[PDB]
Design a protein around this ligand. Structure first.
Ligand SMILES: *C(=O)[C@@H]([C@@H]1N=C(C(=O)O)[C@H](SC)[C@@H]1C)[C@@H](C)O
Ligand code: NA
Length: 351
């Protein structure tokens, strides 16, 4: 007859035990008759034993900087076995919280990347990427790319196919993200891709044409950036929408009191770059719209066309600007991800 054997997922005296996984105990040639896990000051840890009595596991989040003591007894025909193990979990120098976009349960356009923004700089980008689990249905190849030291993006080679489910699990709790930095918690979001909405602003015609699944549904006269401050060419991703908003140039680095500084309240504004490009109402330039460029870079349209855009275009839809005397929108703008060539995006920049 064999004496029961106890096996635990941790070892007695271990330090730096990571807290991204549960602690378990398994019995062999016998069953678990008693399992308790207690922190430094005696508080019991929630756990559950399997019906067949063979495996116990913690069922709640284990804490950073804890010393836990596990006590287990196994009983079998051949006798008894009891063990006591004490171990210490990870002690972070710092915690960072991730924030994910887009919103949970949202429907977005075919240009929307998965966005994970940490509230601290990440020293080990690879460890962050590894901790982020993206599911797509139908499955599609995609890749991570960092816009800066805190925010990473994931997208496919081409615009999403309408009807695609996207699930994002950021499993950073218990994960060492470099230089003693650990995830403050996990976060999860799920979203779905809607209709293909692509609006093209052609500087040769000064028209903003809105296509939904390939069909023209709207043609808006526009006035883009004057030659001195032109609208950059390229692919812009639609972000937030505002019934009205005070445009403050200092938000985008430009002192209000300075030469092309400004602080103006505007109607029906749809943001399409972090650098401050909006589609918005411009009653002052309705005469110029469709004829000459007169703005600071924004896409001036009529009050009714700005409101139409507000009502009918959603986060993640696409605005393409072409044929202007500007350069190309920076790939790392914040809403310019599609201007990065796929070979470069796919290669990433985690190192
Ligand atoms: C965009 O060009 C700016 C925005 N558009 C303006 C315009 O005149 O077209 C006004 S300046 C009076 C407003 C500030 C900015 C947000 O980029
Ligand atoms: Na879209």
């Amino acid at each position: 007859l064999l004496v029961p054997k106890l096996t635990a997922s941790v070892t007695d005296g271990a330090v730096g035990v990571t807290v991204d996984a549960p602690v378990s105990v398994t019995a062999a040639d016998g069953v678990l008759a008693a399992v308790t896990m207690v922190n430094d000051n005696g508080r019991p840890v929630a756990g559950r034993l399997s019906p067949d009595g063979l495996r116990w596991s913690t069922t709640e989040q284990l804490g950073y900087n804890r010393r836990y003591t596990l006590n287990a007894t196994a009983l079998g025909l051949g006798g008894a076995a009891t063990r006591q193990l004490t171990f210490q979990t990870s002690s972070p120098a710092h915690l960072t919280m991730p924030y994910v976009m887009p919103g949970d349960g949202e429907v977005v356009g075919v240009g929307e990347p998965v966005a994970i923004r940490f509230d601290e700089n990440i020293a080990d980008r690879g460890a962050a990427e590894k901790a982020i689990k993206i599911t797509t249905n139908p499955p599609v190849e995609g890749a991570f790319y960092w816009l800066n030291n805190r925010e990473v993006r994931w997208r496919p080679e081409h615009f999403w196919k309408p009807g695609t489910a996207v699930d994002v699990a950021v499993n950073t709790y218990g994960v060492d993200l470099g230089e003693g930095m650990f995830g403050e918690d996990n976060v999860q979001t799920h979203f779905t891709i809607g209709d293909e909405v692509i609006a093209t602003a052609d500087d040769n015609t000064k028209i903003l044409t809105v296509r939904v699944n390939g069909e023209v549904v709207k043609s808006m006269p526009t006035s883009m950036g004057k030659d001195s401050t032109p609208t950059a060419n390229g692919i812009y991703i639609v972000g937030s929408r505002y019934k009205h908003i005070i445009m403050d140039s200092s938000t985008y680095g430009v002192p209000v009191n300075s030469p092309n500084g400004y602080r103006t309240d505007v109607d029906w504004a749809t943001q399409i770059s972090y650098s401050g490009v909006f589609v918005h109402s411009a009653p002052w330039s309705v005469g110029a719209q469709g004829h000459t460029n007169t703005s600071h870079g924004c896409l001036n349209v009529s009050p009714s066309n700005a409101q139409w855009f507000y009502d009918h275009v959603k986060r993640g839809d696409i605005v393409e600007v072409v044929n202007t005397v500007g350069g190309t929108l920076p790939g790392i703008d914040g809403l310019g991800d599609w201007n990065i060539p796929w070979d470069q995006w796919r290669a990433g920049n985690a190192k």
